[PDB]
Design a protein around this nucleic acid. Structure first.
Lengths: 417, 495
RNA sequence: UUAAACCGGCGUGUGGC
DNA sequence: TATCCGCTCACAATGCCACACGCGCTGCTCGGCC
């Protein structure tokens, strides 16, 4: 009936369901076509459907409702919405519109939304009584979000490392600078699992850009919340499509006073995709980029801000370096000064199987006093000072050793003293 | 010029698929097809652009062969004294100096050549993988079904084809299902499809067991061999090293479980698991199961095995299409014969004691001596021709007149074999109508019949070239004789 | 299923018979 | 409830040929289904 209640179910289950509903065996069409035909048959039975979809507007004027499992892409399960609702409520991009729908007749392609029922888990009056994203006051990260899991595990290491190096807060803009083969994807998994198991009160939403399909499957069923991915089976156009989908969805959810955390990896890949989709302007700068080809990525990394009136938008994005090329280096230059949170993963310690390989030297936090209290900052500062004796390798040794003997932050602090 | 070529070779994307060597080989081919248009003379021009060192240098391949057409590439086997070619083959030259360089149509030709070669290099890499990774069953979803083949994908642009003989005769195929098969062939420089998967080849079943039976894979049940009729019947003979292992109850599972599972995975194919034996006779005995045999006559020289099943189970012994035998004939690779039904179906006691018609006059000094001897066999008649005296002393009655009669009969046999050889060598038969023709004596008639004709009517239907290579005549007497023949056969109007 | 080839309607004005 | 009388509109005006031509810019409105 609903979309996700059929999409979180496997393809064989949907085939069996469609065959149970008395239909042409749907194991020949794709899963999206399977659900489309199942909905068409259910609507033929003599009833309406109750659908849900995130909203997209093109230069035409009407609205498209993309689904979750489709990674916010174009498909037959996308619901059509007449522009009349957009003229009524001014529904911008990023509404999980939930409402009643009817089957399409000949000459049509998608289901038509009759009436609105749910606007981003809120009353449709919020569609007419709310505040836009460009008008509020962006602030610094006020709330402190603990990263350590609390079981003393071997991957807890990574979390507690960050906790004693640079914590994460609501409304932060985190950029990870790491060469290839530094343990990026398991870091994403570790930090996401910790933030979702320790703090289920905050909402997670992970973005994957240019990964392997097995990586997509390992990400999608492992972390909580929506797992949006955009792999190589789609061109840079669909890359920017899903990117703009998720950014406007996060913007609207933040407007709805919600805490939205966006993991992103990596930024250089989406920058290349954008360079691919934007035409030239007659001139080519260093690395092979354009003039406006940086405006999209800039905006995309800077949409992060802390909303002091309600909700927040935090982003944790990784970057690619040591690729041999120039464009990645200039992109890192442009994005290393725009973020309000910078962290670095070393490769020399990574290739020695000593993980995690944090750069305790280049790690930093913008205005950390709003993220760390009195004696909390005392402890963090004195430990930074005692680690300050010039060290990368045996500094990682000291950190990992004193972190493996201990379970929590206070244990480490009160055993080192 | 050459700097532009260097820029475009350093600017190619698929440097792993198209390294510098293959890129300049592409440029060789492009300059060849360009010179094909530069001059009306369709010539081959290798140019060895020396990508690392410098620029192109148009060469003129001598293309050593006796013909003359397109003489820019024509040299015989020894015209090599000049310039120090000195070679019968491989010696090449550079006659063309300052050829046409890079017109726009040739740039477009090089462009299309380089893009089709990027495609061909992707094909070459995926087929190197096709050739190395000749291993375990692979899953794939099909895209298109045809009468002769179907096309499959795995992901990451992994195209494959399953041919008609690789499928089953009744396995329904439609675009969208996940079917599993085994990669079987290698085709490095093919033009159509790259990977080749089958579901009907014999060894497929082997690997099936290798991934199903937990015993095989650690080499405790060494699978010996197998034969298969596609989708119909898979026979497989296996051999075990351990003594406490029961492959009759282990390879099949619990009351037909493992064999049944792999049969359902095959798509409805009966399977016969048999125990391999080191004796080919016992192997062909047990391979035709379910069937019982009590007549085993194995001959090694002519690769035959008279394996006769008892009368009554024939309709089940041979089965449809002779499968239970054919697979057996494919399990060991031998030949089987069964024709007898009731008249002495033993096929070993019959032929040993059924000679009352051929042994009527052998000891014809006086029939009242003794019967024939089956201890030696008396059943080959030719290996019998020369036997030593180490066994020619047991039977009684071998007096001197007996061996004298033996010598006389040996002379008679030599005379009859000489007559038979003379009859089989003279496949000419010069009749009177061939010798009576004037100017054609006995040897001339022999040769005329050796030409291929033994009559008079067809003789008048040959030309002077059909009588060429004549021994004893020459083309003018040839024409005279053929005119006389066409007069006595056609122009005479006689019968 | 495969191969080859291919992929003036209207109005106006002028002049002439 | 007849009987012209006159007002008003439809419909038409050879066939060919040859040549030439231009059949526009910008504000406003509307459409709401890639």
């Amino acid at each position: 009936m609903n979309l996700t209640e059929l999409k979180n179910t496997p393809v064989s289950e949907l085939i069996t369901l469609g065959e149970n509903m008395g239909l042409e065996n749907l194991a020949r069409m794709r899963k999206q076509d399977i659900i489309f035909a199942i909905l068409k048959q259910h609507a033929k039975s003599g009833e309406d459907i109750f659908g849900d979809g995130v909203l997209e507007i093109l230069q035409d004027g009407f609205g498209f409702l993309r689904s979750a499992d489709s990674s916010y892409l174009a498909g037959p399960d996308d619901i059509y919405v007449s522009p009349s609702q957009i003229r009524r409520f001014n529904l911008r991009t990023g509404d999980t519109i939930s409402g009643k729908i009817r089957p399409p007749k000949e000459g049509e392609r998608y289901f038509a939304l009759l009436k609105v029922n749910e606007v981003n888990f809120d009353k449709p009056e919020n569609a007419r009584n709310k505040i836009l994203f460009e008008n509020l006051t962006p602030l610094h990260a006020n709330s402190r979000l603990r990263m350590e899991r609390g079981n003393g595990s071997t991957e807890d290491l990574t979390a507690r490392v960050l906790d004693l190096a640079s914590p994460i807060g609501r409304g932060q803009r985190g950029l990870i600078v790491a060469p290839p083969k530094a343990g990026k994807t398991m870091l994403l998994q570790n930090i996401a699992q910790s933030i979702a198991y320790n703090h289920p009160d905050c909402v997670l939403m992970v973005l994957l850009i240019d990964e392997r399909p097995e990586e997509v499957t390992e990400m999608q069923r492992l972390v909580k919340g929506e797992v949006v991915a955009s792999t190589f089976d789609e061109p840079a156009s669909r890359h920017v499509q899903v990117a703009e989908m998720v950014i406007e969805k996060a913007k609207r959810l933040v407007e709805h006073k919600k805490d939205v955390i966006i993991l992103l990896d990596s930024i250089t890949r989406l920058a290349r995709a954008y360079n691919t989709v934007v035409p030239a302007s007659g001139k080519v700068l260093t690395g092979g980029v354009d003039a406006n080809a940086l405006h999209r990525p800039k905006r995309f990394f800077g949409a992060a801000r802390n909303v002091e009136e309600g909700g927040s938008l935090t982003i944790i994005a990784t970057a690619l370096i040591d690729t041999g090329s120039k464009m990645d280096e200039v992109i890192y230059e442009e994005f290393k000064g725009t973020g309000n949170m910078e962290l670095h993963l070393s490769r020399k310690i990574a290739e020695k199987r000593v993980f995690p390989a944090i750069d305790y030297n280049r790690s930093g936090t913008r205005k950390e006093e709003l993220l760390t209290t009195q004696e909390e900052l005392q402890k963090m500062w004195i430990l930074r000072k005692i680690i300050h004796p010039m060290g990368e390798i045996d500094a990682m040794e000291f950190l990992i050793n004193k972190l493996a003997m201990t379970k929590t932050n206070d244990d480490f602090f009160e055993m080192m003293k | 010029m050459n700097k532009e070529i260097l820029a475009v070779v350093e600017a190619v994307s698929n440097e792993k698929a198209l390294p510098r060597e293959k890129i300049f080989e592409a440029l060789e081919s492009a300059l060849a097809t360009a010179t094909k248009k530069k001059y009306e003379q369709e010539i081959d021009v290798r140019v060895q652009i020396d990508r690392k060192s410098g620029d192109f240098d148009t060469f003129r391949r001598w293309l050593v062969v006796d013909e003359v057409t397109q003489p820019t590439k024509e040299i015989t086997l020894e015209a090599a004294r000049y310039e120090d070619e000195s070679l019968n083959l491989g010696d090449y030259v550079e006659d063309q100096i300052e050829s046409v360089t890079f017109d726009r149509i040739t740039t477009q030709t090089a462009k299309q050549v380089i893009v089709q070669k990027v495609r061909e290099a992707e094909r070459a890499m995926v087929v190197d993988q096709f050739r190395e990774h000749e291993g375990e069953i692979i899953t794939g979803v099909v895209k298109k079904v045809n009468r002769d083949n179907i096309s499959l994908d795995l992901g990451n642009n992994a195209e494959a084809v399953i041919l008609r003989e690789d499928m089953l005769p009744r396995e329904n195929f439609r675009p969208g299902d996940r079917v599993r098969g085994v990669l079987y062939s290698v085709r490095p420089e093919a033009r159509g499809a790259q990977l080749f998967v089958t579901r009907s080849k014999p060894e497929m079943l082997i690997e099936l067991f290798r991934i199903e039976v937990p015993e095989i894979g650690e080499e405790v049940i060494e699978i010996k061999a197998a034969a298969r009729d596609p989708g119909s019947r898979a026979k497989i003979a296996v051999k075990t090293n351990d003594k406490r292992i029961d492959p009759v109850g282990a390879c099949v599972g619990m009351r037909g479980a493992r064999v049944q599972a792999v049969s359902t995975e095959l798509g409805g194919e009966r399977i016969d698991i048999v125990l391999w034996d080191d004796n080919p006779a016992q192997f062909v005995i047990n391979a035709m199961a379910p069937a019982d045999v009590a007549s085993i006559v194995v001959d090694e020289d002519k690769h035959t095995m008279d394996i006769a099943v008892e009368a009554g189970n024939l309709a089940q012994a041979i089965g449809r299409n002779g499968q239970n035998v054919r697979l057996a004939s494919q399990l060991s690779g031998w030949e089987l014969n069964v024709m007898t039904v009731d008249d002495l179906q033993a096929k070993h006691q019959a032929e040993a004691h059924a000679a009352i018609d051929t042994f009527t006059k052998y000891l014809d000094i006086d029939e009242d001596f003794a019967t024939v001897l089956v201890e030696e066999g008396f059943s080959t008649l030719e290996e019998l021709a020369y036997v030593p005296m180490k066994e020619l002393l047991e039977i009684e009655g071998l007096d001197e007149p007996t061996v004298e009669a033996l010598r006389e009969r040996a002379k008679n046999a030599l005379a009859t074999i000489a007559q038979a050889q003379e009859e089989s060598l003279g496949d000419n038969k010069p009749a009177d109508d061939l010798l009576n023709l004037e100017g054609v004596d006995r040897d001339l008639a022999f040769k005329l019949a050796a030409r291929g004709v033994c009559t008079l009517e067809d003789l008048a239907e040959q030309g002077i070239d059909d009588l060429a290579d004549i021994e004893g005549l020459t083309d003018e007497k040839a024409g005279a004789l053929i005119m006389a023949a066409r007069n006595i056969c056609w122009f005479g109007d006689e019968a």
